[PDB]
Each structure stands twice: as structure tokens, then as C-alpha cells.
Write a protein that binds this ligand. Structure first.
Ligand code: NA
Length: 163
């Protein structure tokens, strides 16, 4: 897919750690904030995410390698060659792809989903991602207690658990 570069959304220039390529994992994330369905709005959101990550979160740059808007566009975060700040303990081996929006109740539209799969496939073709890469959701990294793990299963039987 034709990637919308940092220059397009007027990203703040930085000098961050380099990425270890090819990446071996793809971690899907959602920004959990507002979505965007037209390019101009997506550029604004991406720019504001970079500012928040840097100024408030103290990250070196925006934490995602790429972001996907519901305009069907793929937006360069830090890109292929820069380390992410999206999932601690995996930022230099995992490509963090974040869907712009909140997708708990509804999924991103077909345009966004297809753009994401196209990006992942292209990553392998170009050598940015290993052909035997592991795809997972943000919560799937083992250090984040999640469903299926022994401890999670036990606390899910405790009072007040999600109710
Ligand atoms: Na986990």
C-alpha cells in the first residue's frame, strides 16, 4: 500500500534507536481514541498522537511503526527502521501496527482491515518481516496477564471480576 509518510502529517523530527530488521512479530494495536475516515483528519490524529507520546509519555517518538485509518490509509509512525515504543520488551523485534480508533464493539471497516493485511504481506515481500512471523494482539505478549494464562483463569473466578 502507498504509505503516507511522516512529512505528510508534519511529524516532529527526531533521532531515535534503530529497529532490528527483519522483525519477527507483528503486534496489532488500537489507539483506543477517536477514529478518522478522511486523510486530513487522520493526519491530525497521528500528529497529535506523536506529540502526546513524546511530550506526555516521554517516548522518543510516536510509539507505533505504522497506523491504519478508516480512510483506508496506512500512516508511517516511526516507520520500518526505527524502534517502537508500543509494547515494552518487544519494541525492537515486533512491528507495532495501530488501528486509529476504538474497536471493542465494532471492527475497523473493510478498507482499514485490507490495508493492514496488505501492509503485513508487503513487509514480508520487502524483507522487513520474516516469512514465519508471528501475528498477535496487543495482549498476547506473555508479560501482560491475559486470557488462557493460569493466573488469569484463577482470578476470573474471583468476586468482582468484570462484574
Ligand atoms: Na498476555
Amino acid at each position: 500500500p502507498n504509505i503516507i509518510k511522516r512529512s505528510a502529517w508534519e511529524a516532529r523530527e527526531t533521532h531515535c534507536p534503530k529497529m532490528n530488521l527483519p522483525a519477527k512479530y507483528v503486534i496489532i494495536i488500537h489507539t483506543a481514541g477517536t477514529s478518522c475516515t478522511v486523510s486530513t483528519d487522520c493526519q491530525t490524529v497521528v500528529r497529535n498522537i506523536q506529540s502526546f507520546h513524546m511530550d506526555t509519555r516521554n517516548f522518543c517518538d510516536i510509539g507505533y511503526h505504522f497506523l491504519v485509518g478508516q480512510d483506508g490509509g496506512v500512516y508511517e509512525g516511526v516507520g520500518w527502521h526505527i524502534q517502537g515504543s508500543h509494547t515494552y520488551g518487544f519494541n525492537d523485534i515486533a512491528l507495532g501496527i495501530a488501528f486509529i480508533g476504538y474497536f471493542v464493539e465494532k471492527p475497523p471497516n473493510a478498507a482499514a482491515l485490507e490495508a493492514a493485511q496488505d501492509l503485513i504481506q508487503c513487509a514480508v515481500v520487502e524483507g522487513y518481516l520474516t516469512p514465519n512471523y508471528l501475528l498477535m494482539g496487543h495482549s498476547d505478549v506473555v508479560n501482560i496477564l491475559s486470557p488462557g494464562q493460569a493466573l488469569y483463569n484463577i482470578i476470573s473466578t474471583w468476586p468482582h471480576f468484570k462484574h
